[PDB]
Amino acid sequence: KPVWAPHPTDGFQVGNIVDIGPDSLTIEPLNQKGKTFLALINQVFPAEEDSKKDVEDNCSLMYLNEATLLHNIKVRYSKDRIYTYVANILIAVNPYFDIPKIYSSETIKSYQGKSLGTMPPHVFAIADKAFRDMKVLKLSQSIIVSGESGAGKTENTKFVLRYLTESYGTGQDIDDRIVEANPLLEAFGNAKTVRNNNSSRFGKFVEIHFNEKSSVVGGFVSHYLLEKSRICVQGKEERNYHIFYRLCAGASEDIRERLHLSSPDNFRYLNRGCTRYFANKETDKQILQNRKSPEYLKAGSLKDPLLDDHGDFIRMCTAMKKIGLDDEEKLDLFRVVAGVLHLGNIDFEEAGSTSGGCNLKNKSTQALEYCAELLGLDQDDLRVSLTTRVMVIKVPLKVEQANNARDALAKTVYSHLFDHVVNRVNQCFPFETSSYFIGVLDIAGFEYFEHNSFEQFCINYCNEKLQQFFNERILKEEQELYQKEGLGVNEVHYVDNQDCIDLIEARLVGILDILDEENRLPQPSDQHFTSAVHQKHKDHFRLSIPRKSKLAIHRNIRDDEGFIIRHFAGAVCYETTQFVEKNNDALHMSLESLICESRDKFIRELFELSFISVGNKFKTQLNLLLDKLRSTGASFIRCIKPNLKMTSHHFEGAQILSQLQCSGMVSVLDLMQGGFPSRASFHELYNMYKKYMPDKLARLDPRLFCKALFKALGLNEIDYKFGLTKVFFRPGKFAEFDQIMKSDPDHLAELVKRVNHWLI
Amino acid sequence: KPVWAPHPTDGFQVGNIVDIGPDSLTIEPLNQKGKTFLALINQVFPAEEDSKKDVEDNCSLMYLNEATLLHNIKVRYSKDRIYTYVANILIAVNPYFDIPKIYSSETIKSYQGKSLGTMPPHVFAIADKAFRDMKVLKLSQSIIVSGESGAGKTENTKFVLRYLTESYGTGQDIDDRIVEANPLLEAFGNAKTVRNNNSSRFGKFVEIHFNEKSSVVGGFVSHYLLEKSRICVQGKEERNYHIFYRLCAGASEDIRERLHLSSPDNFRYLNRGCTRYFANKETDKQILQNRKSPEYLKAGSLKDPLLDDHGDFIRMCTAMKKIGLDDEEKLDLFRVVAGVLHLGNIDFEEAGSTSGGCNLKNKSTQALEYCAELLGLDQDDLRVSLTTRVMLTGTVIKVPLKVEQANNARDALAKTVYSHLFDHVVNRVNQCFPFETSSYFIGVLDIAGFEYFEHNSFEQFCINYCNEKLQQFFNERILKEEQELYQKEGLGVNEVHYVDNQDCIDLIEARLVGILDILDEENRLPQPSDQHFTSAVHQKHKDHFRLSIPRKSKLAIHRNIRDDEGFIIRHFAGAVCYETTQFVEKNNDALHMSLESLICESRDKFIRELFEGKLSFISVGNKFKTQLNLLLDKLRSTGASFIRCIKPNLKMTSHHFEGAQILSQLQCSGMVSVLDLMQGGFPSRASFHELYNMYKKYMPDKLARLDPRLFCKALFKALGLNEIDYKFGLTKVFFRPGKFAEFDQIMKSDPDHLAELVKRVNHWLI
């Protein structure tokens, strides 16, 4: 009798149905006899009889639906239980505080070799299940950690890597080198955004490699789309990459003087964003007064439970030394960071024309001197390369063009530094050969804002391709297997997004190749690119002009000023201004030659028609990643952001429900509950027990020995289902399935004995 | 200067640009000063300076666009010139009257061995180009004749076959035999529809086979999807297959009495359609009064320039006798036709409570007697098989049928007997021109043309799915492979992007989730439902570009159709809304075992030969998919030539060019896109190495010393070709449209010809 009905902020609320209408139900809310509200019949759900209980696996609920799912994970969250299963899929709700001892070395040990369901839900169990599948099925594994910005993807990725390296690594300098290399990646690739204080501005796939003995030999980090625009400008509530602030706050006085550093407000590439440090009462005392910006002295430090610019610098330097980076290497990295900062301080003024173009302002001499010294460049060569350009003819630049050459040089130098850092990290844990790998995927999900540019376009392209993988693995392949085995499982359908992917990535006519065409034209134009997209995709369902938008804020955007992509996760209107500029990874040959001919060996090694497609380079990386994903066994962790305020114990029902809906988790609740996540063929099960079986058992058809074995083990006909060639085990039966699958000879003998006792 | 701007019925109208706005052009129509209309900038095209002229190849126009194409086709049509090229593709506009001597034996001879462009555009030239390619390239050929219903596909297919057999045959009756057998195929496979008085209700692929000497050895006809529903019921403006009317109108009194025939109004399988004969003042006098239905006596005869039920019967019988069918065989065919007619006259009535079944009405005794006698069946065996169904239970037992189920068993038996008769007729025709072995073939494809009506069923669905598949072959061969070749050769030809029609194929034939497979699933269920099938289609294909619910239709006649009662398929040739009622029934080719056993165990040797507890199910859709994939493998393995037929109006009238209707066909056929791609296309090509090697034993040292490309350049220049006519690629030399004659001269391997051209090069080499 009480049901779940919609609630604007809680998602659902308890009530009683008092009336019915076509398409509607009248709901009386709990302890409010008289008051009523209407709801569409498909928005009203049965509730669990016991409202105080919680289940570890959502598949155990009497009624599995979006409302019961939300309530179950709510109750668990209020008891600081952030992990809950949906069969072998994990849901992780960001606690926004450190829950005591749930990631301890003791907690790690307790999860080792334990079947799913034998221990409470946890990321450690997902990591252990991937290890056991790799070890047993002799197949590489993938762990996909999904969710919105601030959901907890990066944190759960670290928990997976720590679990695997601590458990299946002997305990060696080599073994720790995968975990210890992380503060280095975050310093150069993470930054403070409005949604996350430690936002990842690059995607990653971290592979832990194993030998034949299922022991860690080493690892490999693949990185994607480092956000270039952040290098030069940030919003007032955002910062540039952590490294700049860690170096400004933590460097020794000798380092600060050698790099000519000062408080962040002195650098153009930092002073448009927030120049405040992450610090507490203690660490603020360790930061010298000369490193503190006026804003930091007025507003105080930024607050975060773990981020600390001074502490993170010391930790970073300690990690660098432990993984094998010497001081020379460390100082070379800092020199480039400082060089990039001084570069941003170079200002230009119009020349008297007469002679056209621009000059460096006399106030920029000191910045020019510092930048050229740190980048090992000749001062006049840098001065010339920032105010002129070559195109056959050398021509002067206007102020605006000079500001752009300076910003292009900074973005390219920094991006090349990040690539060096990722390669250097890979060089700490290399391996001659491996049998298998366990790969963890940590990358930004589908996103949109008021104004959508190339960055959003690239990320949303990635998630259109990943979505196809998710649909194919969880829905298409799973339901196909049930069909081929004649299990009669109720069919769950999905919209195929191959055409959406085609729109973007089709050869010649794909958006990426149309964009490439534009970059190779004599007069490249964003308007011309956008027109060529609309002209080449007239009848297309997925492609629309901005004037067809539902939102009024887009109706004034011209046909040649944008496009609407009807993505699987919802329509996104893109403003196409600067798509041509952002699509070029190549530095102009005049700037390229200048930096390649540096006096510094380190700088030259960063760089060891100027056009390199950002979109097509990314498509090639994405396809390689997708080939690895498709060739491996896949495990999924869906991270949930509980609120928009980074607060603990603030479960926002409506916001959480929207993520459960949008992620597609709801659409698969009935598939997953009425599914069979564990399976084995009757022949392989029979062949494994064959040498232990007596004639009475051996004479039987494989199907019949399996039947006898399951019955002797106290399994009911509900817990499993026999197909044509395979036996299938329901969710919540992983422990029993692993007991049936255990190949240990003493174990095989022991079970044959149980069968013999059951037959008598 | 005057331009082409849109016109609602003419497609385009000539006008002058007087103003310009942000998205428009203000047009003043010709000779109408002061009057104006707005058009989108994208919809206004340059016109040819000379409006009275016409060009034989549309590639010759100064401005190649849809408006100039339409006008060129129009001007030629007004001068009774129904054929026009788009390089090596032919456009054929149905004249709807006999143009004098353009298909004469004299016209046939004049096209023999002539290169494209040397003679006016004509189907004979497409047939000759296919012959020359087969002889020279040692590769089988296919001629694809496309277009909607009434466009002229069947007529142009006949012209091709007559040309090839008359030109490249023995000279005896053996070549004529392929042509002479046709009245037999049309009598059994063609019928009067609202779009065409002689509509083809089956698809065909006619192969003319050749020996090593490129001489006709024989032929082979492949047939696809004869329409089953027409055998039993037709609309008031349509008829059943021609044979029924030809036999009713032309049979001798002894034949009429032996088959117990009468006027068409006496048969259920004819009296729901139009029972009027095709006749003129003269032939109506040859039809006896006892053959004439009340409707024929009231409304008079049906009018057609060629179709005549009395005359076509005599012609059919004359053709049968000439190709080798004796009277025994002829009478056996007529007997089955009459047996099918009498079968339809068997009516049923409720049996009562005791058995919840039915009985034959006492008024149906005579029909039962006649049917059983003509089909060589026992009367009581037929009575039992039409009113009962055998079931398992494991003892064999019968279960009574309800009236509706017995009407269906009767109709299933008629459709199966008739279909088996048509298969026999196609095989018998193949037996008239067999061959032990052949080197190559020239195949002509004449499929049932794209058609839609007020109400669209499974027949239209199957027809249009096939018309779709052949548009995909055209797209793949002309618009895909062509541009890929130019790319692989580095020619830098401007890329043409067309809307593909593959997504529509996928929707229909995709495994498991395809419409054909979902329909088979439905037939295999305990309670098969059309609504359940339609729901499954909509559920598995959400937001598809080619799938839509019927209420989303543009036409008012489809907006009251329920979601589970139909679907809209967006075909390349225009959106079609299908009513899905009876899709499950029409998708079953199988006859229930009781009816199958009854017809296989006939007393008649002819009937038995027509025919060689579980579910009786054979998929019509998947059987058809398998035939089409086989045909498509054959097409993909041959050199392809295309003829695009155009229907000028919806009234079957001559000298009525409907611009808007014609333009729509030019758009939907991909001709508008082909024209674009020929602005820089190269339909003729050859390896310069293979070309150099062919002349090497004839060329002097001065030329032999040169790089192959250089001898080729010397040869092209010596032959008066300009640098604009040709283009060198990485491995091939390419020639622009309008240079076929010159390219064929370059390619001629005849040693005397090779020597003669080397002499021309030596004269050019001063």
Ligand SMILES: Nc1ncnc2c1ncn2[C@@H]1O[C@H](COP(=O)(O)OP(=O)(O)O)[C@@H](O)[C@H]1O
């Ligand atoms: N399991 C967790 N335990 C403690 N704090 C967490 C946990 N997961 C996330 N957080 C907090 O939330 C922040 C955002 O998490 P993060 O992994 O960076 O998100 P994402 O990578 O999805 O954007 C963290 O920096 C941390 O403060």
Ligand SMILES: Nc1ncnc2c1ncn2[C@@H]1O[C@H](COP(=O)(O)OP(=O)(O)O)[C@@H](O)[C@H]1O
């Ligand atoms: N070239 C032609 N010359 C004379 N009559 C023609 C010609 N093409 C077609 N017709 C007329 O138009 C009718 C329809 O032609 P048909 O070839 O049967 O069309 P389709 O097979 O494409 O539906 C013919 O029966 C004939 O009356």
Ligand SMILES: [Mg+2]
């Ligand atoms: Mg992250």
Ligand SMILES: [Mg+2]
């Ligand atoms: Mg026809």
